[PDB]
From Swiss-Prot:
Arf-GAP domain residues: 3-118
Name used for this protein in its record: Stromal membrane-associated protein 2
Residue spans, zinc finger C4-type: 18-41
Gene (UniProt): SMAP2
Residues annotated as transmembrane: none
Amino acid sequence: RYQAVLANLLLEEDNKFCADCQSKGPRWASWNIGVFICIRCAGIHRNLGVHISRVKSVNLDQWTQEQIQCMQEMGNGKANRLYEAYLPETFRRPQIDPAVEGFIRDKYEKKKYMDRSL
Ligand SMILES: [Zn+2]
């Protein structure tokens, strides 16, 4: 029902890369946060708990209109501005599982780098 809408959102340039690790062509999402993520980072989001992140597959899960709306109102661009506001420009974005797990908890659970005014 909503694959088309999701497809059009996956065309947005920021959404062509995982929000957390920037690997190309993410096919998963945290819909309450509003980010498109790769399957590995979706695995990490899942373990954060549903109080923090609620993870769906873009192509295997059924979506509600409100959940789609969540992605429309955020996405990886707007999410970077909120959750990575205070990320040093020097920062080396991690790539390996345990470093990525720390970075994702830091971003969404601890909110180390978040601009709270947003
Ligand atoms: Zn990722």
